mmCIF file of C-alpha atoms in Angstrom:
data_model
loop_
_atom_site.group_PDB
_atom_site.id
_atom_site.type_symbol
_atom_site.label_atom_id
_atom_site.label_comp_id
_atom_site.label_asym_id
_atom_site.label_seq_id
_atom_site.Cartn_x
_atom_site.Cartn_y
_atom_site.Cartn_z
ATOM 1 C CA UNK A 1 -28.337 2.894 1.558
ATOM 2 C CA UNK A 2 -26.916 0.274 3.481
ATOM 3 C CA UNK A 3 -24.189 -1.616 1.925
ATOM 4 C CA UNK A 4 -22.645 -4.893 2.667
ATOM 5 C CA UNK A 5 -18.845 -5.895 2.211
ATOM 6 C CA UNK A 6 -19.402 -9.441 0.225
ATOM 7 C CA UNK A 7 -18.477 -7.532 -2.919
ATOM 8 C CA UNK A 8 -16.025 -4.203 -3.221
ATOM 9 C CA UNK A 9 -18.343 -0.902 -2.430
ATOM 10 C CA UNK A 10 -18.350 0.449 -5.649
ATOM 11 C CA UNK A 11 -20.720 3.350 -6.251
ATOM 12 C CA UNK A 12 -21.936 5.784 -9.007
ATOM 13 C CA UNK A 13 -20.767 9.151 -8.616
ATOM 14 C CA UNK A 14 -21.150 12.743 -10.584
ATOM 15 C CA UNK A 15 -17.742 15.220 -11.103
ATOM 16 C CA UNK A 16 -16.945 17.696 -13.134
ATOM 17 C CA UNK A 17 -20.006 17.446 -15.558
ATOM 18 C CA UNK A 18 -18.970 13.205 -16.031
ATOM 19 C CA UNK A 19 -20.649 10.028 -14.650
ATOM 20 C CA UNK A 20 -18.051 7.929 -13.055
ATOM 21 C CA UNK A 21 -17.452 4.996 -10.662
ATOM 22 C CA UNK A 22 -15.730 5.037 -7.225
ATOM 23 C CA UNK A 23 -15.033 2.829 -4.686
ATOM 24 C CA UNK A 24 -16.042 3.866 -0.984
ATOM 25 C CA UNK A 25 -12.640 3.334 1.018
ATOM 26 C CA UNK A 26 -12.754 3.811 4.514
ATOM 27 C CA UNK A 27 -8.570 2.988 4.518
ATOM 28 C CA UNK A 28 -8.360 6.435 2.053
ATOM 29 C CA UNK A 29 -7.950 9.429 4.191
ATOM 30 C CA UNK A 30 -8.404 11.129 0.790
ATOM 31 C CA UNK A 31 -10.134 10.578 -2.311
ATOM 32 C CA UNK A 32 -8.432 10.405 -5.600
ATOM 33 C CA UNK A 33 -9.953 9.991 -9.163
ATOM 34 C CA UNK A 34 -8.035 9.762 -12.555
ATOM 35 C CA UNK A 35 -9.610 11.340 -16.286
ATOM 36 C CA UNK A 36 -11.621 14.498 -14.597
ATOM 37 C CA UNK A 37 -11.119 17.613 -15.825
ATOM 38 C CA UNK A 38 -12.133 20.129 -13.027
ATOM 39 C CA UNK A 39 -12.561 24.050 -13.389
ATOM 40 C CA UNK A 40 -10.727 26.618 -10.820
ATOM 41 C CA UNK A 41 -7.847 26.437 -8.902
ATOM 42 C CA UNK A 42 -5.523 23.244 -8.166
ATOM 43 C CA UNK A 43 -2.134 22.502 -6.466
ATOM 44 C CA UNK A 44 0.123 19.752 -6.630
ATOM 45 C CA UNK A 45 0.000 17.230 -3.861
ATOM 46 C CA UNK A 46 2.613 14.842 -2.898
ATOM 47 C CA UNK A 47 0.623 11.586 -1.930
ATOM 48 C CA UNK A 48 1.650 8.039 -1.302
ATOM 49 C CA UNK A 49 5.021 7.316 0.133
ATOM 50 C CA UNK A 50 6.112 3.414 -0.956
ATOM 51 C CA UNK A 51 8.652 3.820 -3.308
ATOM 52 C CA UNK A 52 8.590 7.253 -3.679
ATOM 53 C CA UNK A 53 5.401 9.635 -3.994
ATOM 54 C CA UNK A 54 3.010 9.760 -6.382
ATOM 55 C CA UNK A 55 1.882 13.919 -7.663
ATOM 56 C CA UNK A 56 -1.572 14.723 -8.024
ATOM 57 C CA UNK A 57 -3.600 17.737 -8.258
ATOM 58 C CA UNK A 58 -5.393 19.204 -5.346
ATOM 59 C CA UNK A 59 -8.750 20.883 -6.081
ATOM 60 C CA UNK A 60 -10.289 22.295 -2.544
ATOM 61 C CA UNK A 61 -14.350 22.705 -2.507
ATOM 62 C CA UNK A 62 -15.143 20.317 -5.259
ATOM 63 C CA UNK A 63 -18.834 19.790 -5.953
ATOM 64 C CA UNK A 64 -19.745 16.278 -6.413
ATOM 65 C CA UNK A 65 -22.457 13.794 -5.799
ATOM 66 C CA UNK A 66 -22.011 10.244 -4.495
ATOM 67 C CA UNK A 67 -24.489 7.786 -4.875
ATOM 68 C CA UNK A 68 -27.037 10.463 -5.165
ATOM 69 C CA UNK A 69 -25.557 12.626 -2.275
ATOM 70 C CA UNK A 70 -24.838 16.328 -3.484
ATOM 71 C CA UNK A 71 -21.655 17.849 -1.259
ATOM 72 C CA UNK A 72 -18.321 19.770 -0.998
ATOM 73 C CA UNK A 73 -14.690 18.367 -0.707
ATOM 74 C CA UNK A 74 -11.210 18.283 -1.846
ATOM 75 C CA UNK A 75 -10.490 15.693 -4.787
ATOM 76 C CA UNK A 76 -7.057 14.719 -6.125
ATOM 77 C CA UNK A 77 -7.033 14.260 -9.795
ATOM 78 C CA UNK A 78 -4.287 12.134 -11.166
ATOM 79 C CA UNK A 79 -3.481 8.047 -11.909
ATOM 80 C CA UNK A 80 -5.018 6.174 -9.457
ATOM 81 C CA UNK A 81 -5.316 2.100 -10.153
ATOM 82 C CA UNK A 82 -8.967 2.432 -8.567
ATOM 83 C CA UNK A 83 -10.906 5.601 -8.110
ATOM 84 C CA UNK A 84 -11.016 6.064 -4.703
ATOM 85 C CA UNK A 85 -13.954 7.992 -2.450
ATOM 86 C CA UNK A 86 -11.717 8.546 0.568
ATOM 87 C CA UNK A 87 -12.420 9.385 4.528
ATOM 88 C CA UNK A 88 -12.896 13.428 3.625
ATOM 89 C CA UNK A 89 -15.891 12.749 1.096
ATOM 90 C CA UNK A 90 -17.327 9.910 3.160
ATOM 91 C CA UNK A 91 -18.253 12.522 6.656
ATOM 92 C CA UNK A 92 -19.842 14.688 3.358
ATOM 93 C CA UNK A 93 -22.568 12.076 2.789
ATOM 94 C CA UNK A 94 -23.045 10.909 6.269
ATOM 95 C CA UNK A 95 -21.560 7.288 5.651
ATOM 96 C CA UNK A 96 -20.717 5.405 8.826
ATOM 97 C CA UNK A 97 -19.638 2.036 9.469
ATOM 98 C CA UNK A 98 -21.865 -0.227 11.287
ATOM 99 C CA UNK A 99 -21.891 -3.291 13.420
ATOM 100 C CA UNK B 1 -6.542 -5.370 -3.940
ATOM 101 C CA UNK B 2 -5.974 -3.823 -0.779
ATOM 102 C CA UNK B 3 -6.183 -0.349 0.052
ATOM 103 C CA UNK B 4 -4.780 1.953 2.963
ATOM 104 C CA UNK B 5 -3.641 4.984 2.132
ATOM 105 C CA UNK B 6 -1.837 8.427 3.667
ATOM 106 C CA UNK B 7 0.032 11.093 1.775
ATOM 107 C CA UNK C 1 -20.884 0.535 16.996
ATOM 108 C CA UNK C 2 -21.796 2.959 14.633
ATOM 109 C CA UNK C 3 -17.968 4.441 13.327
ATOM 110 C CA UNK C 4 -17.884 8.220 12.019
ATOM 111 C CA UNK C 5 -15.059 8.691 9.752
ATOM 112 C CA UNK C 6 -13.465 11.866 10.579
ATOM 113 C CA UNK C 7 -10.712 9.945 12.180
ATOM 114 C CA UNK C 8 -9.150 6.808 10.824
ATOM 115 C CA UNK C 9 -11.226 4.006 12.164
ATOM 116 C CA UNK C 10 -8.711 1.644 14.468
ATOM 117 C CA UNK C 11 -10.112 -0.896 16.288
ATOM 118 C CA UNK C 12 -8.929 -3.215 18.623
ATOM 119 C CA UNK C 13 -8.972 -6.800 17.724
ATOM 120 C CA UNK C 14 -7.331 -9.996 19.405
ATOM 121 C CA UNK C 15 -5.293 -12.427 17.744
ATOM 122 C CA UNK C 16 -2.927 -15.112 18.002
ATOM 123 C CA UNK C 17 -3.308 -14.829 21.891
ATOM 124 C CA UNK C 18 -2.013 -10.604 21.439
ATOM 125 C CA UNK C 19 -4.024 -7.552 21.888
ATOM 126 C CA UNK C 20 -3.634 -5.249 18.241
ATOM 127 C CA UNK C 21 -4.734 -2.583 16.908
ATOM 128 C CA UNK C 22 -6.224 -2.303 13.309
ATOM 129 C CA UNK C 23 -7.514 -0.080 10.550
ATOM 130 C CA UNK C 24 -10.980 -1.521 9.394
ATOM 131 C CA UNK C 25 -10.072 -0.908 5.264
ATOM 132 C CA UNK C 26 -13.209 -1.156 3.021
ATOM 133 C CA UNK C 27 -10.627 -0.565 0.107
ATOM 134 C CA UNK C 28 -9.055 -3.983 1.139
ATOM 135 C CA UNK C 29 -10.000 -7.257 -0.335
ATOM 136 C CA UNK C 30 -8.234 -8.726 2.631
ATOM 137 C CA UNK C 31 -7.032 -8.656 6.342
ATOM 138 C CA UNK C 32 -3.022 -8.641 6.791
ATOM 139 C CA UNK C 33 -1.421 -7.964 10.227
ATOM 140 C CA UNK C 34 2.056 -8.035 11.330
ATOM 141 C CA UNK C 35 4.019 -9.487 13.685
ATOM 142 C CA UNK C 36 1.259 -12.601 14.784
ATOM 143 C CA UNK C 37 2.439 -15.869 15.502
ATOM 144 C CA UNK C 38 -0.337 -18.013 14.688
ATOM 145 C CA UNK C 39 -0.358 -22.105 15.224
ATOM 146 C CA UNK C 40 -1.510 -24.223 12.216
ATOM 147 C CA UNK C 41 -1.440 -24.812 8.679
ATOM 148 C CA UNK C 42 -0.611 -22.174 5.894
ATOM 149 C CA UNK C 43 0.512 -21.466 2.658
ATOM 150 C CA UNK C 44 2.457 -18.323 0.750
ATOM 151 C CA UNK C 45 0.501 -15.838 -1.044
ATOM 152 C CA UNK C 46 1.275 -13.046 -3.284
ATOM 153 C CA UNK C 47 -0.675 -9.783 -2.889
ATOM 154 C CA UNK C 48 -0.348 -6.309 -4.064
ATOM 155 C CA UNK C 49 0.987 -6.314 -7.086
ATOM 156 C CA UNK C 50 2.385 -2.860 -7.619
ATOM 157 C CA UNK C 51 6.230 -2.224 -8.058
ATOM 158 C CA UNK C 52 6.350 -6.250 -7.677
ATOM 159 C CA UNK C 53 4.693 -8.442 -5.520
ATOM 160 C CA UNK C 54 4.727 -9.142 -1.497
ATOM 161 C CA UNK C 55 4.667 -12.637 -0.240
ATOM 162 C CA UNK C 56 2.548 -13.043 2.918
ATOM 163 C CA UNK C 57 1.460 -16.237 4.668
ATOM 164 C CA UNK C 58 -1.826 -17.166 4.172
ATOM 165 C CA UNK C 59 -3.559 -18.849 7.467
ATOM 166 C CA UNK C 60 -7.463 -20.139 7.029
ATOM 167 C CA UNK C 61 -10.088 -20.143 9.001
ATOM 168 C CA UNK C 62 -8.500 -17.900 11.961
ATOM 169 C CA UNK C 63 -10.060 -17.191 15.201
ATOM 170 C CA UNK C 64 -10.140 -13.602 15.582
ATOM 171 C CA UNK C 65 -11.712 -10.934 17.968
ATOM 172 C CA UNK C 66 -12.237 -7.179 16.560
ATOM 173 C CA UNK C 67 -13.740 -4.849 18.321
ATOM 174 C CA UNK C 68 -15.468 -7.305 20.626
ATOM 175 C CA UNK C 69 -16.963 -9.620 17.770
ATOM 176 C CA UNK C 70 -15.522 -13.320 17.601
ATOM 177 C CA UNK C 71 -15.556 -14.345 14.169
ATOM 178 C CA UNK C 72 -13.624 -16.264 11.963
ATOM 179 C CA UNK C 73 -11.979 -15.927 8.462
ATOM 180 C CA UNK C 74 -8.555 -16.538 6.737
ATOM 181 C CA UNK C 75 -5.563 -13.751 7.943
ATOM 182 C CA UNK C 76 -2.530 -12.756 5.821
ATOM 183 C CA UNK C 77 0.642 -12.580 7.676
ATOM 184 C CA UNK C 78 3.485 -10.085 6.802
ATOM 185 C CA UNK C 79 5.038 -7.022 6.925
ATOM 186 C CA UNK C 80 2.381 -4.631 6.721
ATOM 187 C CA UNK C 81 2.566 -0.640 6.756
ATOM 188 C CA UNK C 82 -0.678 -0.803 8.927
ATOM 189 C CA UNK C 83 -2.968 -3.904 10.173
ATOM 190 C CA UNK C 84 -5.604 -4.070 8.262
ATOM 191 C CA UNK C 85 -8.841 -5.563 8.913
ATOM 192 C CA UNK C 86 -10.257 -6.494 4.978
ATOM 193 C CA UNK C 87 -13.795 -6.963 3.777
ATOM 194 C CA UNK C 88 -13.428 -10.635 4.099
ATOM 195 C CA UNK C 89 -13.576 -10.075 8.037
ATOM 196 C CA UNK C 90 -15.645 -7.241 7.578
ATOM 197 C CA UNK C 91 -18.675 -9.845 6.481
ATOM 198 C CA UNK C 92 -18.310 -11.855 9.428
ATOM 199 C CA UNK C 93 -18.850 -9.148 11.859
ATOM 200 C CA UNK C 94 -21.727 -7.680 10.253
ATOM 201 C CA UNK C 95 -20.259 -4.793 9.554
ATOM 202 C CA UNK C 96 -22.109 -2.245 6.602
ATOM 203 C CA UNK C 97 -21.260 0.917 5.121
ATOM 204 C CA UNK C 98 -24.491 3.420 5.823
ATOM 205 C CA UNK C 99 -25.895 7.062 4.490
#
């Protein structure tokens, strides 16, 4: 699709057997989603930095599908305010910016 | 909201 | 242009009579940059929210330049970790996400 920016970029995604929503942030190097329960092997993560880090979990090679767009990256699972679909996931499905 | 982000 | 996204996508913009550099940030309502000393009218404004608030000045209806576009649109002004250019200047260039 092409998307405009008059409204946040929130899409429909598929993890871990659940329907969820995301928002496509190109200021994310990383995507991270809350309330996912993935199968197979994880690591913690120190991410953020502003007041001290937040600790997620880092699953490598997770299958999911964006906006109907079936591919492979790492997703951090932990409290996020928004779920984020960051820079890694975004090469995945092709999505460039445009102007 | 506003939304950069690095680990 | 058409931006890939395996590197974070900094532009170059022009502003307050300075060349900058900033990150163009789907994930951001708005466009704050630091250290601009812009004429005119303007008014404080919280934003984030997290930990507490930040208080940036608000200017409307700035002339701005990114990435060869002259557009228009309102700038916050304040210590920022990285400029960011928001979807609110994001719709006046034209630019879309695509996949």
């Amino acid at each position: 699709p092409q998307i405009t920016l008059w409204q946040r970029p929130i899409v429909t995604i598929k993890i871990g057997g659940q329907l969820k929503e995301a928002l496509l942030n190109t200021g994310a190097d990383d995507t991270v989603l809350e309330e996912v329960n993935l199968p197979g092997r994880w690591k913690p993560k120190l991410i953020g930095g502003i007041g001290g880090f937040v600790k997620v979990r880092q699953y490598d090679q997770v299958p999911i599908e964006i906006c109907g767009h079936k591919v492979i990256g790492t997703v951090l699972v932990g409290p996020t305010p928004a779920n984020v679909i960051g820079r890694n996931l975004m090469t995945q499905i092709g999505c460039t910016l445009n102007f | 909201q506003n939304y950069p982000i690095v680990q």
